[PDB]
Write a protein that binds this ligand. Sequence first.
Ligand SMILES: [Mg+2]
Ligand SMILES: [Mg+2]
Ligand SMILES: [Mg+2]
Ligand SMILES: [Mg+2]
Ligand SMILES: [Mg+2]
Ligand SMILES: [Mg+2]
Ligand SMILES: [Mg+2]
Ligand SMILES: [Mg+2]
Ligand SMILES: [Mg+2]
Ligand SMILES: [Mg+2]
Ligand SMILES: [Mg+2]
Ligand SMILES: [Mg+2]
Ligand SMILES: [Mg+2]
Ligand SMILES: [Mg+2]
Ligand SMILES: [Mg+2]
Ligand SMILES: [Mg+2]
Ligand SMILES: [Mg+2]
Ligand SMILES: [Mg+2]
Ligand SMILES: [Mg+2]
Lengths: 43, 48, 185, 37
Amino acid sequence: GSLARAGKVKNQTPKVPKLDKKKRLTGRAKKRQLYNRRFSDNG
Amino acid sequence: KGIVVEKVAIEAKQPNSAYRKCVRVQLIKNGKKITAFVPGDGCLNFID
Amino acid sequence: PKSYRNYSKTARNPKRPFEKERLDQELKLIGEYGLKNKREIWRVQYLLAKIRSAARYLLTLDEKSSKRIFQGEALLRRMVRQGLLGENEEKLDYVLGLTLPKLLERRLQTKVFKLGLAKSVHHARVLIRQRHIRVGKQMVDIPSFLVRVDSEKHIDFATTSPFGGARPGRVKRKSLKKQKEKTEA
Amino acid sequence: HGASRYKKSRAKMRWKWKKKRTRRLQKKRRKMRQRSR
RNA sequence: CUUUUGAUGUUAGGGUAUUGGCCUAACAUGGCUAUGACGGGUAACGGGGAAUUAGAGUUCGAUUCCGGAGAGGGAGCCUGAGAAAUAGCUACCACAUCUAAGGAAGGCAGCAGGCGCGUAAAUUACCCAAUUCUAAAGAAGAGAGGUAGUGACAAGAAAUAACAAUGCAAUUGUAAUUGGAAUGGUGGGAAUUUAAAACCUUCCCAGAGUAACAAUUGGAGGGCAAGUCUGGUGCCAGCAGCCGCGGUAAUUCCAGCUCCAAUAGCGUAUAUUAAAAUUGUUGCAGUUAAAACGCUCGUAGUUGAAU
RNA sequence: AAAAACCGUAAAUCCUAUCUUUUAAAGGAAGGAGAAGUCGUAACAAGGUUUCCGUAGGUGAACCUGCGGAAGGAUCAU
Ligand SMILES: [Mg+2]
Ligand SMILES: [Mg+2]
Ligand SMILES: [Mg+2]
Ligand SMILES: [Mg+2]
Ligand SMILES: [Mg+2]
Ligand SMILES: [Mg+2]
Ligand SMILES: [Mg+2]
Ligand SMILES: [Mg+2]
Ligand SMILES: [Mg+2]
Ligand SMILES: [Mg+2]
Ligand SMILES: [Mg+2]
Ligand SMILES: [Mg+2]
Ligand SMILES: [Mg+2]
Ligand SMILES: [Mg+2]
Ligand SMILES: [Mg+2]
Ligand SMILES: [Mg+2]
Ligand SMILES: [Mg+2]
Ligand SMILES: [Mg+2]
Ligand SMILES: [Mg+2]
């Protein structure tokens, strides 16, 4: 039948590159940051 | 493991409306034939 | 044949992955004691559960029974030696009142922070991992080391550390080098 | 399907007529199997 | 069901290392069974044990130790204290080697290694130094055994920063800027370890700033923690274990940003345990949801006043 | 020593006889799913002949009729 429509929208969407670097913290420092954001500034 | 024999399209159940992409496979182990679904947006044309 | 050395696990998963209150309480504890994952909390919970199970089983057993006397004295001695019971509450019924902050207070990290000697609990963890700390003439670099009662008065800097009377590190020596060739030419 | 036969809460075909239809079919099958023996 | 051709016993012998229908002759008609015989199936070697469970239970155990069986499939045999032995011998069935065609040789379910099979599994390495065994018993030998190579089966510990000053919303905190200390990972050389093989530990030299020495895998409607944010598509493409989403406003598709979870780990498939008081002895239901035999008698079974 | 005979232990091959598993097929006849199909209107209200059970006949189809039973009835009542 009409199985030539496969992958229509994937080829339709226009490509866009990603942002530059924005490195993140890993491990114990990340948990420290989460703790400070969720509890320290709130009272 | 198996060898691809045919590509087909299958209807969806009644409240929905689409054509799902599948292949027919003959198994190496015992020669039987099964039907398998190909997941992904355009993954069917990865298959010959 | 197969080797005759064995092994065992030390932690367990919470059976209910997205409970709000448990998650908030765990974040409390992690931020208070400066830990890395939920695995550390879970391993301490495992240890405490084993202790409590032994205590319950002994407490069901008959008063002035032989098994009760032997195993209860052994367990109470272990608990008081670890620094968890005290002096006026060694009765096998105060074992069932032990909480998570009690055990989690005996880590070398918390002790190094509380004994002055470090500005913060994170600073404390960093110093332990860089070979700066001794526990009685033996240098230790593991923050989960649990300190016993008779060993908490011997925590100090290491003799091979720049903070404990030795040569300075790779940065001081390079700065002094560069300064020397600057000032001699 | 014991005493719950002939239970009617959904507008289906009557139970005894379905029974009769099945019996007619079975009689045909028996005759055609006997003819080969 | 078994019993003509030993099935159950008695008598006399034979044979064996010894008892025995183990075998031979004569005699008798016995032996087992609804408390399941005789048969069928097992993707069944049995235990010590393993997984999960409050207590009961359910499911696994080819595989470190113990016992049994076998060496392509069957049968027979020599030596010897010990074998119905297979890196001992003799035949037949299958497979296969060399050849001057007359003939002669064979058995990896021992260690490596190859083909095939498949979703599914490592080096044709070093050594007798340790544990032990054999001998004409210090001194020889041992793919038993040990050592290394491959190895995200499984298990334990544990980095990817910390601090100070200055600015800045609230003593904090840090989408920031400055500046000095502290450290392994990494390269070289040693002291050691080891059959002057390599790990590990310990010293000396060099050596972090976008510390580019740059963390991932799945998700964000509900169950279930986390976005009524932008662009594209328009019942198509696709998503979704389940309910569901998709016709211009798509919180669910395809992307960008941001958040959430676990984290050197995280998803998917099949099987199994709890959840399941949905197999119920503890502990289920049977008027109408599934389910009291049409009715009575009756053997086996289960249960039976007081002294 | 070669070589024979006999009573035994007995691989192997063949012919029959059952049994277990897998499998071909003219034709016949069920079930499930799908699509806007054709014919009627049997059930749900007294559904326009109250419904239903066992049995026995008949008819394109759903169904109709005889004999005995029930209320889960449209009657807890003269
Ligand atoms: Mg019923
Ligand atoms: Mg006889
Ligand atoms: Mg076994
Ligand atoms: Mg064995
Ligand atoms: Mg073989
Ligand atoms: Mg043999
Ligand atoms: Mg052989
Ligand atoms: Mg061999
Ligand atoms: Mg091998
Ligand atoms: Mg594997
Ligand atoms: Mg030796
Ligand atoms: Mg001698
Ligand atoms: Mg999205
Ligand atoms: Mg279960
Ligand atoms: Mg259960
Ligand atoms: Mg239960
Ligand atoms: Mg029930
Ligand atoms: Mg009755
Ligand atoms: Mg009517």
